[PDB]
């Protein structure tokens, strides 16, 4: 259930609400809405930042 | 590659794993299957002395992350031996409920399951209890056509035993429109149980045949009466008229007469 | 139709179904589209939302390698070009329901049908 691929034009996928950096896997999806507690998907490099 | 590490920290972790209550098995345990050398790492944690919650979170971790060749070695080395030890050591010789989980959680990709568990089991040391428990295992979970037909034909390439006949019945319960070579394996399987002339076919057709053969061959007569050729119908009716059951036999004859095309 | 073309994708979706690399969905076709190791990736662009259209135009036509174009629409018959059926022609009685747009990694079939519509017809 996603309509969040408003992407940049011609043509590559560079994403607002920026992605993750980890060799463990692909890490080509967003890191989006957070509120006083974060959760960066996958198992890259934690990321205990503020919201 | 054939190197390793210094610790030897999984003795301290594995001593904690023997007293583990519930939840998620710890973060130092979560890094075992990622190694190529996971086999020697897990043997430090004493896998034969676990609790079933460790069995669940562990088996959930190992099956859903190792490759099918690696999960083949995991099930072949451990879960098969843990399965037969859970049958043998238990004085009721039955399955625990908490051994009534992770196992067919692990079955949803049946390739590594069949390469690890089923194919050594039915070819070595299979009996009526493993056909009752594992017979209850095969029917409840998802399976595609290729594994059912291939493992079914692997059952049909075996000599006669009622525990194998249970698994044949369970695979005949799924009622899939089989490819014709699997159908011909079923017909060529069930033809040789009648008493032929010439010589001996060989000793398995002259022995008494239990009710499970009439139930599985009954199920094949029910679903597969409209997908077999007429010569196969006449040959299986020839098998029925020599080796039919007192009650199931004429019903198999009636369902084979009820078929067409 | 009675000639030797269009029938690659009919069979390459059987030989490439062997390796189970069919990244098929909105978010998760990008799994096989985070690299260009996929080769013959069919696409449609006509239902709703105008999003994956824009994704296919940029994953198919990036300035680097992996630049095919095989636009062919009507994904509800693309199940019929896929391998949902275990047909045995008069035997099927099976799950007829849909098997839509694929992302083909690990081809399985070797230069016989594929060069007909890819090489002979799309790339010069």
Swiss-Prot record, chain A:
Residues recorded as bearing Phosphoserine in the entry: 21
Name listed for the protein in its UniProt record: Small ribosomal subunit protein eS31
Subcellular localization: Cytoplasm
Subunit architecture: Component of the small ribosomal subunit (SSU). Mature yeast ribosomes consist of a small (40S) and a large (60S) subunit. The 40S small subunit contains 1 molecule of ribosomal RNA (18S rRNA) and 33 different proteins (encoded by 57 genes). The large 60S subunit contains 3 rRNA molecules (25S, 5.8S and 5S rRNA) and 46 different proteins (encoded by 81 genes).
Covered range of the whole protein: 102 to 152 of 152
Covalent crosslink: Glycyl lysine isopeptide (Lys-Gly) (interchain with G-Cter in ubiquitin): 6, 12
Role this protein plays: Component of the ribosome, a large ribonucleoprotein complex responsible for the synthesis of proteins in the cell. The small ribosomal subunit (SSU) binds messenger RNAs (mRNAs) and translates the encoded message by selecting cognate aminoacyl-transfer RNA (tRNA) molecules. The large subunit (LSU) contains the ribosomal catalytic site termed the peptidyl transferase center (PTC), which catalyzes the formation of peptide bonds, thereby polymerizing the amino acids delivered by tRNAs into a polypeptide chain.
Zinc finger (C4-type): 20-43
Swiss-Prot record, chain B:
Family affiliation: Belongs to the bystin family.
Keywords associated with the record: Cytoplasm, Nucleus, Phosphoprotein, Ribosome biogenesis
Protein's UniProt keywords contain Membrane: no
GO biological-process terms attached to the record: endonucleolytic cleavage in ITS1 to separate SSU-rRNA from 5.8S rRNA and LSU-rRNA from tricistronic rRNA transcript (SSU-rRNA, 5.8S rRNA, LSU-rRNA); maturation of SSU-rRNA; poly(A)+ mRNA export from nucleus; rRNA processing
Gene behind the chain: ENP1
Highest taxon of source: Eukaryota
UniProt miscellaneous comment: Present with 21600 molecules/cell in log phase SD medium.
Subcellular location: Cytoplasm; Nucleus, Nucleolus
Organism: Saccharomyces cerevisiae (strain ATCC 204508 / S288c)
Residues bearing PTM Phosphoserine: 200
Phosphoprotein found in the keyword field: yes
Cellular component terms per the entry's GO annotation: 90S preribosome; cytoplasm; nucleolus; nucleus; preribosome, small subunit precursor; small-subunit processome
Name of protein: Essential nuclear protein 1
Example GO molecular function: snoRNA binding
Free-text function comment from the UniProt entry: Required for normal export of the pre-40S particles from the nucleus to the cytoplasm. Its subcellular location and association with pre-40S subunit shifts from mixed cytoplasm/nucleus to all nuclear in RPS19 disruptions, suggesting it acts after the ribosomal protein.
Swiss-Prot record, chain C:
Pfam families according to UniProt: Ribosomal_L7Ae (PF01248)
Localization annotation: Cytoplasm
Chief place where the protein resides: cytoplasm
GO MF annotation, one: structural constituent of ribosome
Function of the protein: Component of the ribosome, a large ribonucleoprotein complex responsible for the synthesis of proteins in the cell. The small ribosomal subunit (SSU) binds messenger RNAs (mRNAs) and translates the encoded message by selecting cognate aminoacyl-transfer RNA (tRNA) molecules. The large subunit (LSU) contains the ribosomal catalytic site termed the peptidyl transferase center (PTC), which catalyzes the formation of peptide bonds, thereby polymerizing the amino acids delivered by tRNAs into a polypeptide chain.
SUBUNIT field: Component of the small ribosomal subunit (SSU). Mature yeast ribosomes consist of a small (40S) and a large (60S) subunit. The 40S small subunit contains 1 molecule of ribosomal RNA (18S rRNA) and 33 different proteins (encoded by 57 genes). The large 60S subunit contains 3 rRNA molecules (25S, 5.8S and 5S rRNA) and 46 different proteins (encoded by 81 genes).
Name the UniProt record assigns to this protein: Small ribosomal subunit protein eS12
Species of provenance: Saccharomyces cerevisiae (strain ATCC 204508 / S288c)
High-level lineage: Eukaryota, Fungi, Dikarya, Ascomycota, Saccharomycotina
